[PDB]
Amino acid sequence: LRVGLFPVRYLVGTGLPGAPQLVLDLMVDTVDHSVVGRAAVSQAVSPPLNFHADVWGSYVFRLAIVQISLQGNQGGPQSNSMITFYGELLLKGDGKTGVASYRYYSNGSWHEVENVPVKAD
């Protein structure tokens, strides 16, 4: 409801057959430097991976990287559900490309995807 917000969609992954794919639909508040949105992790493997989380975090600019830290769960930050997602995006300063790592919880275990490409749109 305040002026300072914009959306952005990031596709995180190598894009290789059978590789994990993370889609982040993010809201960015350029005043408080805060971020909120959704994470979806899928993989065209057998069985199908359909992981989802409400995510939140913040961004920081260092001179040129824009670093976005995210964590997530079922419901968001006011929910007391366990954190099931952590992500760190190291985007180039234009906010359109970069590298990312993340960890997600599924089937009683953590799964980590490290240093994969990031693109917007």
Author numbering: 5 to 67, 78 to 135
The study reports:
The Q63NT7 protein from Burkholderia pseudomallei is 212 amino acids in length (molecular mass 22.5 kDa). It contains two predicted domains: an N-terminal domain of unknown function (14.5 kDa; DUF1842) and the C-terminal domain (DUF1843; 5.4 kDa), which tends to appear in multiple paralogous copies within individual bacterial operons. The N-terminal domain was predicted to fold into a β-barrel composed of eight antiparallel strands. Polar residues are found covering the exterior surface of the β-barrel, while the interior of the β-barrel is lined with mostly hydrophobic residues, without space for a channel through the barrel.
Q63NT7 presented a challenge for obtaining large, well ordered crystals. We also observed inconsistent crystal formation across our replicated crystal trays. Even so, we were ultimately (after approximately six months) able to optimize these conditions and grow larger rectangular-shaped crystals that diffracted beyond 3 Å resolution on a synchrotron microfocus beamline. We collected data sets from these crystals, which we refer to as form 1. Diffraction data indexing revealed the space group to be P21. The highest resolution resulted from data collected from a single crystal specimen. Efforts to phase the highest quality data set (form 1) using experimental techniques did not lead to immediate success; selenomethionine-labeled protein crystals did not diffract, and we observed no heavy-atom signal in the diffraction patterns of crystals soaked in caesium chloride or potassium iodide. Form 1 crystals gave a combined LLG value of 719, form 2 crystals gave an LLG value of 394 and form 3 crystals gave an LLG value of 305. Because the form 1 crystals gave the highest resolution diffraction data (from X-rays), a model for the β-sheet-rich domain was refined against these data and then subsequently used as the starting point for model refinements of the other crystal forms (X-ray and electron). Final refinement for the form 1 model gave an R factor of 25.1% and an R free of 28.7%. The backbone r.m.s.d. values between the experimental structures and the AlphaFold model were 0.35 Å for form 1, 0.49 Å for form 2 and 0.46 Å for form 3.
